[PDB]
Design a binder for this molecule. Sequence first.
Ligand SMILES: [Zn+2]
Ligand SMILES: [Zn+2]
Lengths: 139, 139
Amino acid sequence: CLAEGTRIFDPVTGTTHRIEDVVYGRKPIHVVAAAKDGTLHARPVVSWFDQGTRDVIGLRIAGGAIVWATPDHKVLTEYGWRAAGELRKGDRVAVRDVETGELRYSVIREVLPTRRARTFDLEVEELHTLVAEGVVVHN
Amino acid sequence: CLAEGTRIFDPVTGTTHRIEDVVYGRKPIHVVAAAKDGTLHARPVVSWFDQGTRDVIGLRIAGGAIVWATPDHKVLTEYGWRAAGELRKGDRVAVRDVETGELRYSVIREVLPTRRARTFDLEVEELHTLVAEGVVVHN
Ligand SMILES: [Zn+2]
Ligand SMILES: [Zn+2]
């Protein structure tokens, strides 16, 4: 689950949305998703979910981004799918290079304390993952 | 997230496992996964997760099965991905016909009250879903 305020870049329209708005209006946007062979493609959001308030932690990535998600959220790392919760400073997560648009790895700056906040999800045709706050994560 | 005691049928070895054991021993098993075109294929478990205790609800399906999962778990239904929590008696979920091995829909008999219990997850190569307790669900 992802907290409200999570930025989801629409690779097709270049537009950046706040996840909750995508959900609230069941908006048919696209997101950047990475194939198992580690890549990145444009994919439509076929499902929307208002998961409700839960506890989210926050991983501040090198570059500036900060992901707020439920400790169980799978994040792509220098290992492959892992749980946000079981991640620490120094660990590298998969991200979308804003320039090239390629998958690379950024170090976590610091892991922020848990908090309450609305949460959401989005399923994505095929690939099954999305790029949120510049970080590749499990859809 | 899925509660301990969840049965995962290994389509390749015909063997039925209890999810937690798969996790505890990082067992490289296979599960039945359905392609977006609604089907069912054999797929290897590439990841394992010990999600920890959470609250799980239980959907008792026609035929006998009973799925215990976190209210946010996506289940394939006569609608497509939905959250276990927001499901009621009469709703139909996608399942694996034990005989033919085809995807079909079974009615929910009753939705059981929430409870505490260890939870787990398994990622599955490609398809991204598994058949648990005879019910198709989101991996
Ligand atoms: Zn998915
Ligand atoms: Zn997956």
